[PDB]
Design an enzyme around this catalytic site. Structure first.
Site, PDB file in Angstrom:
ATOM      1  N   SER A 146       0.852  -1.181   0.000  1.00 53.87           N
ATOM      2  CA  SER A 146       0.000   0.000   0.000  1.00 53.87           C
ATOM      3  C   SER A 146       0.890   1.234   0.000  1.00 53.87           C
ATOM      4  O   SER A 146       2.084   1.180   0.395  1.00 53.87           O
ATOM      5  CB  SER A 146      -0.878   0.004   1.279  1.00 53.87           C
ATOM      6  OG  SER A 146      -1.530   1.251   1.456  1.00 53.87           O
ATOM      7  N   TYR A 159      -2.733  -1.228  10.289  1.00 52.96           N
ATOM      8  CA  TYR A 159      -2.534  -1.359   8.852  1.00 52.96           C
ATOM      9  C   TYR A 159      -1.198  -0.766   8.410  1.00 52.96           C
ATOM     10  O   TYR A 159      -0.455  -1.394   7.658  1.00 52.96           O
ATOM     11  CB  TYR A 159      -3.677  -0.680   8.087  1.00 52.96           C
ATOM     12  CG  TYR A 159      -3.649  -0.975   6.610  1.00 52.96           C
ATOM     13  CD1 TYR A 159      -4.308  -2.102   6.090  1.00 52.96           C
ATOM     14  CD2 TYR A 159      -2.985  -0.123   5.726  1.00 52.96           C
ATOM     15  CE1 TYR A 159      -4.290  -2.375   4.733  1.00 52.96           C
ATOM     16  CE2 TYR A 159      -2.962  -0.381   4.368  1.00 52.96           C
ATOM     17  CZ  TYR A 159      -3.612  -1.511   3.878  1.00 52.96           C
ATOM     18  OH  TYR A 159      -3.581  -1.760   2.528  1.00 52.96           O
TER      19      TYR A 159
HETATM   20  O1  LIG Z   1      -5.336   5.626   1.448  1.00 52.32           O
HETATM   21  C1  LIG Z   1      -5.259   5.114   0.135  1.00 52.32           C
HETATM   22  C2  LIG Z   1      -5.738   3.663   0.102  1.00 52.32           C
HETATM   23  O2  LIG Z   1      -4.756   2.832   0.700  1.00 52.32           O
HETATM   24  C3  LIG Z   1      -5.046   1.451   0.709  1.00 52.32           C
HETATM   25  O3  LIG Z   1      -3.997   0.779   1.366  1.00 52.32           O
HETATM   26  C4  LIG Z   1      -6.347   1.192   1.462  1.00 52.32           C
HETATM   27  O4  LIG Z   1      -6.661  -0.181   1.439  1.00 52.32           O
HETATM   28  C5  LIG Z   1      -7.472   1.998   0.819  1.00 52.32           C
HETATM   29  O5  LIG Z   1      -8.674   1.772   1.513  1.00 52.32           O
HETATM   30  C6  LIG Z   1      -7.084   3.483   0.815  1.00 52.32           C
HETATM   31  O6  LIG Z   1      -8.075   4.277   0.191  1.00 52.32           O
END
Ligand SMILES: OC[C@H]1O[C@@H](O)[C@H](O)[C@@H](O)[C@@H]1O
Ligand SMILES: OC[C@H]1O[C@@H](O)[C@H](O)[C@@H](O)[C@@H]1O
Ligand SMILES: OC[C@H]1O[C@@H](O)[C@H](O)[C@@H](O)[C@@H]1O
Ligand SMILES: OC[C@H]1O[C@@H](O)[C@H](O)[C@@H](O)[C@@H]1O
EC number: 1.1.1.47
Lengths: 262, 262, 262, 262
Positions: A146, A159
């Protein structure tokens, strides 16, 4: 089709029935690969995903598994080898998230996100590399990270941690197994048009707000992420290892600083 | 007496009985703080350290606790508030490591390192911040990371992942609690003369190897990291939050590239 | 008297007559150092600053020079060695900026910013290090960078490039001269209350905008950066080389992501 | 062929007659693009490059130009538009380097590397973006960086600086022009088998030494870099902007840390 070296390559994708996982299964199906679709509980979506891959030009099976359970991850890679003959590309895509003020985040909730997002990727990466090593295959690992391996994320400290760990995990495995021709890479998606975000993007003020943090001005289509996966998996990326390839429309470039603000 | 503003501040230090934790314990002692020394295993070391803190001009208690157990971490912060009246600086220092080829790393060994290095620091950070929020205190958190939140580390994928995770955790909490004046920073030690390295360095060939990977040429002294902690905890660092401050004699600068190889 | 080891050290500071350069001038004055104040343009400011350094407990000269002219930089270091006997800390602080859409930026405007911000710092660093090598001194170099060695800056591509370049320059020189005990570090200021920002902040709407981009909530005070410089120049930072230490109230942590947007 | 959206796209490549530049011209020629080959003095190599592109399936012209001269860069982009009708992809590839102890590096030599490596890329990027903006084309910029935008490089402080600046330059332009659908990216090659390195790789101890810093164990073939360029240029990278895609066989992952050293 585009990457001909992908024809008949065995590709395992965790959480591959929906969102980015599904879009990747389809794209590899377009490259005439043999895809193994992992899924958690919704069997019908997986079955749907399976048929697209077939219709796109690919072979496919589905396999139930919870990535927080070692036996399931072990079974997944074993089933892939059993059914298709080998394993070529491993894609650790499963992930969960939920907003909580960090000082109120429970240990159980922290653990669930760490276990799923980071540990599950370790388990998947380990089982694939074990197999490539034992069989002298120059295989390929793709870990779904991410923008939040780089962009901190208040309310999502679990996360953010899980992807920060994923980054060093990936970079470690790439360095460790580079002498065996095993490449290990992350993809860093930004805001993507997927089931989990499909709720968020209902509210037109929320959709606009999110779009305001994407310099390119649109929410990514999952196929744009799948394009990065096919590139990384292919022999076109032969000299590319240990990287994170962000596909985020510029989100990591600090969207608050547009127009010379600051 | 360097940082006068540190006088009588309450500083909790996990793994404060040996190595860097001890070095830091002593240092805040020299700044005449109230040092709470967490230890897991070995009361006789913790007692010896409680002494040094007292001789140095500081006040000190020792508190037994396992950083992987939530009750122990909660009890630790609670004990500091009982014994000393409040909390000012939370230092999450406890960490473990062991070499295993990654494709042979067991889930339990992976979990132990993650639980200890990253989750314990989350729990520590969470409990401190909660105390800071609810009581309007502009407290401070120092998380002990490593050159290995940036330098990948084959045979130590679990350790690398834990520190990569600690980086994003720290950065998220710094961003999340900045508007409240709560600062959250990492220290990144290189190869330091500590118990975690005693076996490695006893072997003169290995000590020489490690030294050839430090640009400055010497294995770091634990007090050189404690200086960094004192700075960060002080009001001298008032505009400094969300950073990792590496104290590594240049290790993150790529030792293999000295003298223009490449 | 905080860093006693700084007493009587020779500290050269380009652009030391206003803003952060002045703040640093004063600070090493409080540590009773010998501060050499470079200025380009405006003797009356430099005189006013020479005074503050003297009142603070320090010794000070002022030396006119343009950092883009090699003779001026060489003369500056030579003058410090004539007037004070030696050189201990070289601080390259001079910088300029102006907003231009990048596709409209002229080569001369690009060159002026690069010449000033990056090349002047190279020249400063080179002359100091040369003096350190040839005379066996374990000297120190502080290069004044910016959050914009990391945060990209539309309308300021020249400025961003100069600081990105300063980062790799600093890191290379830290690695190259580490085995000689010469340390080389960057400071990365965010939005600071200085003359470079006076017009921006005079507009209450713009001051509010900039403030909303600082997580800690206030525009930085120049003495908060000078604290960082004093630390880095001191033997407290003995194991610290090749780093960028951001003093930015969290700006590098992505202000647009506060409260979990995204 | 692979990327069909590249058919008939106009691609300008500076220093495109030899090494990575040539390999890129050929690859874009394989994608049936129209390539504009810039060159400094060796006209015959350029002519050779031109014929490969033609033989590979592409259209091509050659154009003399020194990238340190604004008029040449301006003429280059103008000639491309004159001859082929438009401009779609701009590739700033020209670069020079030479080893010098940093404290002995002359201003003229510093400037030559900065002017060529960084400033030339700015000029090329500017002229291309100007054109895309004025004509509402969703064009593409690729700037040839190096592992040395991240890996410091003793004896090559000018080179390291130039690429550190290139990184922030690229990231700035990507953020600035992302709202116009103009993507801007870096490629980060490691040790590649090219004319400039062909000398270094003569000495079999030098070849081995360099190979020892590549985790994948071989010096990259220029075609592996060209593969990254074609990907980045294509609509496959539609959501990829502001990134550096390292193609270095793991070199940025710290090769000294293989086998758990450190
Ligand atoms: O923040 C930007 C994006 O990052 C990703 O890692 C998340 O799963 C999304 O839900 C989020 O919109
Ligand atoms: O590799 C440099 C050092 O990193 C530290 O984080 C580890 O605890 C040490 O064991 C190691 O020597
Ligand atoms: O150091 C790895 C490689 O980096 C590139 O930027 C240089 O041009 C090469 O000569 C070098 O071998
Ligand atoms: O953007 C944050 C700050 O960065 C500094 O480097 C600049 O000099 C300021 O003008 C700017 O406000």
């Amino acid at each position: 089709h585009m990457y001909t070296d992908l024809k008949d390559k065995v590709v395992v994708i965790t959480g591959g029935s929906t969102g980015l996982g599904r879009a990747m299964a389809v794209r590899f199906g377009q490259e005439e690969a043999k895809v193994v679709i992992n899924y958690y509980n919704n069997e019908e979506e997986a079955l749907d995903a399976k048929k697209e891959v077939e219709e796109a030009g690919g072979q496919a099976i589905i396999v139930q598994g919870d990535v927080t359970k070692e036996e399931d991850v072990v079974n997944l890679v074993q089933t892939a080898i059993k059914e298709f003959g080998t394993l070529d590309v491993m894609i650790n895509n499963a992930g969960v998230e939920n907003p909580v003020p960090s000082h109120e985040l429970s240990l159980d909730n922290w653990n669930k996100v760490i276990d799923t997002n980071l540990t599950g990727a370790f388990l998947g990466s380990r089982e694939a590399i074990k197999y490539f090593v034992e069989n002298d295959i120059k295989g390929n690992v793709i870990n779904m990270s991410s923008v939040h391996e780089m962009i901190p994320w208040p309310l999502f400290v679990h996360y953010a941690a899980s992807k920060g760990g994923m980054k060093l995990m990936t970079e470690t495995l790439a360095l460790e197994y580079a002498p065996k021709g095993i490449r290990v890479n992350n993809i860093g998606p930004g805001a993507m048009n997927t089931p989990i975000n499909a709720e968020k993007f209902a509210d037109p003020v929320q959709r606009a707000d999110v779009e305001s943090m994407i310099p390119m001005g649109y929410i990514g289509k999952p196929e744009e992420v799948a394009a990065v996966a096919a590139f990384l998996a292919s022999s076109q990326a032969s000299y590319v290892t240990g990287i994170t390839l962000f596909a985020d429309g510029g989100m990591t470039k600090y969207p608050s600083f547009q127009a010379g603000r600051g």
